[PDB]
């Protein structure tokens, strides 16, 4: 089983398994069971912006998830993620469908990472910036229904020629290089991470949501990862 | 009066103003009298680093003091700054001796702030970072005795023609812009502040120290600020 | 008399003074003469954007101007620009109007400067982006008919409150900080700029045009550097 | 035969197969025979830097050579890149020895690459920096006789215990994850790269040099290419 952080944009209440009854933003440390949520307040249609924030001093993992002209939703939890996540990892973007669908458009996706390490004071750092995605777009790895170069995006789910999302669908991807999230030698170790989303829906509930997410380098969606799970974990533990 | 924000390397206790019984650093919101402190292992004529960061999801002030080998000193207290610092602000350096003396030489200095507006979901963003310092550096504001060239430094305080710290000395350099710390209607706001910084006293008693700070635009160092007040404060309040 | 390098953006073809016959782009050394120009299809009420870049390796100052979808124009001018302009100097925007008008706006600003030092091998570093201009831009110096805050922009010539452009119209924006523009020891130097604009016009003929430009820092508007002098030269030679 | 375009620091002048006289840098398209050189004044045992430059508004590809208070050597060609690149590549250092041997050792190694697509107006970035290399550098492809972590350092080809170099090796490290090097559709696109050697020989004649080059993205060492084919080409036509 995949060592998974995740921050997931979650659009359908999952009571059975612990979600709160709402559309919610979660910090999921190694089970979609959230650490810590917050009420989210979706609107169907519209772009959003996700952007996550990590430093090794206060350790402690926030998100904020905004519309244009409209309020914030921010959820933070106290973690150590050397003692969560091996030395090396592959970030990237999840999303799922169920009984229930929506579309998982992603339309920029940067991210930054940094170490100053304790022995010699000199950083080392990855940075990349997706605005818009390739047919055939290298840098990334594309699991499961996860396709690019349509209108210039990323589409996480699939999304028929007729424009409709489909259901019991999964789709993930991450970026091609592992990054150094973490090493015992290291001062100082911070990273930043920015999407942007737009989640359309033609029935009355969408679902399921998108997930940021950091994990051993050879993760792979797991077997039954749909729906609820977010193409992150296989089971609700 | 102006509004100090600062980060102090406090290489003397003053106990008498409360200072702890070793050299220390401390975050000074609105007074030389520190929120919070942690006990700093100085290294005498030994090349250090300061790693101060800031963000208005947190609104929290962290701040990490290292040398190389060693284990790193770290404090950090939970404020909004936007409560207390104007718009607009200029950030500096600082550094002064008493009776007590050391050389306050500063190798190298970075910063960067960062404002993303929620009208627009679109950044504003300052950087500026000196490896090295020159004689006419018309980038930053010399207060008092800070002078730059020497070696390509800049001394805070003031040495001699024969290597030698001298008391009673004060100097401040101020980055040349202005910048803007806080807006009202911002998503996130961050900042991000690096130096280096080799103190070097023939003494057995090194003091006063160095600080880093965010002050209103206008700011000059106050009448008689020399030694435990570190050119930041009118008094000890 | 002030020194000036701009990159001109000339909507209005003055050939009594060497514009071509049709609105261009060029290169301008010490003259409102450009060295060099390309035709520019300029595009009345279009956002665009203009992207300037000089290194010292290959000492040749290059322009491309485009819209989405449309060619782009370039110029290019070989030239050693220190041998030009003084070691410290300022940048900034400008625009004017004449007999003819248009909207000169400005919807983003980004510069960024470089220096690698011969003596140390290490770097000096200045970069700002602007993306929203507020009604109070402190580390903005606004001259002549300049005005920010309106729907977020820099509106450099003269708009009224129905939203028509004057004519007979001069303004410039300058950044705060003096840019560290050559030094004699430094192995490679390069500096990058870039904007966005809007020059819209109810004109059949919109006047007179953008520049960005460097300076030295204390420069200010010449008198009577309104219409095809563009708010940098005194007279037209 | 794999594309290769790479920019080398030649310690050793093979005059039969078109070498000047002297050790030099130069700049190959898809030879192993430079299509420009440029005297170089090689200083065994320092430390020097290499700056790589390349932008599509000019396409110009530069290279600085440069040591601590020496004069630089700069060499440079006019080259369309996107004639002879595939769109995607791995970017990568490469060095070699022959009967004559040197350390060749890389300190620091940084690149940036930079695409602004016409459909948008909006930037695909990345960057990555090392300053020092661990023993499992995760986002690095060694090849050949390549090895990190030995002072944090990445050593290209051998060098035995003592520090003593080792002949007739050849070794490559390549950034993980894949690059888009230009894009028909751009207006603007550009890279720069930056790194730090050590060649240090006990012979009178050091060889055979070090080189960034930039290939095909499955590019591996060319059979038999140690001595004066640096890693990069399988003969020397
Ligand atoms: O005791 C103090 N101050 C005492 C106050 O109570 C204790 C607080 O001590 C300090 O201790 C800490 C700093 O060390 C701080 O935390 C404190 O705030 C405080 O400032 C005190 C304060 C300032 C001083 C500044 C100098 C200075 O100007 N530096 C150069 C070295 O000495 C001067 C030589 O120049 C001339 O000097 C004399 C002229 O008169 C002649 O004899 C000499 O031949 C010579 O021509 C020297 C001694 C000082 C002593
Ligand atoms: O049709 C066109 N558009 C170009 C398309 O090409 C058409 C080719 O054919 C033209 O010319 C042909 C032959 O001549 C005719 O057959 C055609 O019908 C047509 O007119 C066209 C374009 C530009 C023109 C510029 C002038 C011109 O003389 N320009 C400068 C004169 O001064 C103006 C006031 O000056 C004041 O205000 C200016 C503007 O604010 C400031 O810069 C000044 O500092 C000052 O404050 C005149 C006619 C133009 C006609
Ligand atoms: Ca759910
Ligand atoms: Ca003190
Ligand atoms: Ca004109
Ligand atoms: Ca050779
Ligand atoms: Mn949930
Ligand atoms: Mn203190
Ligand atoms: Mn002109
Ligand atoms: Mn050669």
Chains 1, 2, 3, 4 share one sequence.
Do not use: C
């Amino acid at each position: 089983a995949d060592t998974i952080v995740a921050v997931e944009l979650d659009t359908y209440p999952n009571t059975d398994i612990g979600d709160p009854s709402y559309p919610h933003i979660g910090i999921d440390i190694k089970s979609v069971r959230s650490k810590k949520t917050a009420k989210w307040n979706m609107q169907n249609g519209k772009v959003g912006t996700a952007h996550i924030i990590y430093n090794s001093v206060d350790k402690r993992l926030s998100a904020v998830v905004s519309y244009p002209n409209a309020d914030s939703a921010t959820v933070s939890y106290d973690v150590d993620l050397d003692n969560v996540l091996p030395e090396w990892v592959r970030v990237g973007l999840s999303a799922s469908t169920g009984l229930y669908k929506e579309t998982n458009t992603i339309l920029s996706w940067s991210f930054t990472s940094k170490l100053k390490s304790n022995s010699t004071h000199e950083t080392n750092a990855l940075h990349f910036m997706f605005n818009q995605f390739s047919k055939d777009q290298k840098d990334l790895i594309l699991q499961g229904d996860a396709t690019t170069g349509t209108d210039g995006n990323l589409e996480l789910t699939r999304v028929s020629s007729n424009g409709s999302p489909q259901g019991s669908s999964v789709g993930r991807a991450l970026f091609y290089a592992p990054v150094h999230i973490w090493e015992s030698s290291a001062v100082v170790a911070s990273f930043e991470a920015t999407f942007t989303f737009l989640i359309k829906s033609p029935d009355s509930h969408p679902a399921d949501g998108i997930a940021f997410f950091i994990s051993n380098i050879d993760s792979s969606i797991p077997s039954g990862s749909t729906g609820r799970l977010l193409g992150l974990f296989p089971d609700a533990n």
